[PDB]
């Protein structure tokens, strides 16, 4: 794992069965948790939906852990590790995605795919509504040999008030590597530029690994 | 529109935990007297390594007996068709999201699926193939912003006993504007039965009638 | 032990968002005609601020006609009785939770009953008193560790149209070792027959009869 | 209102699975530090046959360290005061819901608590007693409706390793009008300091400080 690596991804999915393909590029250092990319719609444009029900599909790698915990994703590479997701919406509508993640030289590649389901018409994804993510804390521990990772968060709205969701994530490395304790992970995922129908978007993620109070 | 002997044609394509599969089927039956039956075949990702069982419910509530006195949905989405969605998430976790667009060509239904399984753990019953069968089921059916919803949640029973739960939510959106119904019932039951060692082929059939409940 | 005309009494005491509340209860019914009736008397909290219909179906499996292919977890349970615990998830975030403890004097059952609801938003059908009914439903019974469990998702009508939707999860436990069922159902319609202005006294009706799903009905 | 120490006293009634209990408690802490301590009696009910931890969580936002860039929803709430509902919904179905009505006598807050849990099944980590502790969690904070609330998923550690998951959902409501916060967090960790043999004795501390996460 180097101080500078690239990433290269194609999301290939459907909401309420309409599909649609994103492919995006992008930079980033693991060990300052920090990344960003330039996202393209491929097919199924313009999406009818809001984007930002994608963004955190589009890496654990990118989150900076201290030395006192254990980083499970640094250790997965070369080989890699995959990930899967149900994203639960307040008000019924579903995602799963998995993220099929391997590296070439210094490229993390991505194999994404994404399906959402019972989405209302009148709802704000539907509807557009959406303005940005909340930072969250990702609540990870072990089950079963592997790590699991759950985050209830929120989307704030148009006019103000917020629209939860619940993540339920599991990530599987390729190979055995050592387990952690149960940590926290603090998210800020931020959309900084996008064109009028979001077939172009420059995203970018802010992740730190803590173990909670004392600090 | 409805005839009373149709035919229906399929393909799956989707993923349990990442592993994507695809399924083919052939079948036939009888709209209005709420019977069907269909043979499977995988086509890509065999042999299957999850329990057949998650898949059969998402192989249409056009077969479903449906009284004069409670509004068909279904039966008057044809021509033109309708498609559904549904969310089914079990008690361990593991959902799977699920979409099937149903059109007509002549007196056969045709299913495009998608499936999308995920969060099943190694340990379970899923992937670890102890599922026997759906058991009988009653689904509640009622309309929500100008579509028909359904929801059902019910069990597979396991092998050594004991039921594993799951709560099925789906979305019906008929193409054409048709008639919506009142609160009322499809009660349910899917079978499989035959099937290869692998599933690789796979008889299933499923009984449906609607109703009120008990009366006032 | 169980008479074809049976009587029943009950109390409940309980509160809805932190406000407590007491109501008592006399009735009667048919076990094996899976009826019974009741009239409720509000004794303490009123006027109750919330809709009376969260309340109905806290208000005994007991009362249902169970086909004699179908094994009666209930009705095997006297003459000691049984107990049941409940929490009632609607789809606004508000929870009840019940208990109830089910003992037999003669010919009456008495019911010691506990409700708690919280998180209903003061926006919501309950705090405004918009519900009409709940819809028929078909329970799903189920056995877990040697115990009885009870799953039914059902629905209230609105009274501007709409339903608002709720998940039952019931753990029945008789109080004596009693024969498991299999994995049965058993269909439901619970009425408010009569009223008061306040919901002060409320008369009450239940019908339920048991079944296996299809074939058949 | 509110002095850099203050004092605690409470009463809890309720029961588990149908069997009543009671619990009163004195404790003190000091509000701007986020930081309390109290010892709890068990008074009626006892010896308690399920997990003491279950309760700790419903055993006062305003011992949480508020910066000055994030509105306190609780200080600005006395001497009026407060209360809260929550539902506590653990993974394998056993559910709590419990209120506290919070009030102000001089120095003392006074915590009036109902607590109810069912459907915790007899093999569980509550009913076998088998939790550890929580661990340290971070609760997010939200208006909705003009009142407070606040989610949290969080787990208790068990005996044989593993976790046992729980989700909280909480409703803050003012006595008075008072300014309502931004989304923010806080985070919480919960110890049982000491307790004896069947916990008829409990000594409990919690630590909290808000926050508006990343970067910080």
């Not at 654990?60 to 030395?67: G, H, I, N, T």
């Not at 509504?129 to 909340?134: D, G």
């Amino acid at each position: 794992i180097k101080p500078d690596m690239k990433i290269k991804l194609r999301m290939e999915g459907a909401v309420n069965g309409h599909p649609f393909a994103i492919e995006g590029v992008g930079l980033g250092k693991p060990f300052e948790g920090k990344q960003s990319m330039d996202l393209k719609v491929k097919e199924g444009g313009p999406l009818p939906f809001a984007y930002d029900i994608l963004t955190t599909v589009f890496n654990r790698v990118f989150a900076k852990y201290p030395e006192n915990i254990v980083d499970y994703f640094k250790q997965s590479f070369p080989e890699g590790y995959s990930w899967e997701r149900s994203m639960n919406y307040e008000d019924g509508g579903i995602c799963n995605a998995t993220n099929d993640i391997t590296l070439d030289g210094d490229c993390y590649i991505y194999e994404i795919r994404f399906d959402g389901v019972n989405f209302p018409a009148n709802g704000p994804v539907m509807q557009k509504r959406t303005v940005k993510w909340e930072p969250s804390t990702e609540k990870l521990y072990v089950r079963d040999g592997v790590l699991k990772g759950d985050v209830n968060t929120a989307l704030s709205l148009e006019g103000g008030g917020h629209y939860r969701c619940d993540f339920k994530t599991t990530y599987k490395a390729k190979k055995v590597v050592q387990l952690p304790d149960y940590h926290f992970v603090d998210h800020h995922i931020e959309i900084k530029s996008h064109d009028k129908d979001y077939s172009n978007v420059n995203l970018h993620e802010h992740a730190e690994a803590h173990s909670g109070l004392p600090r």
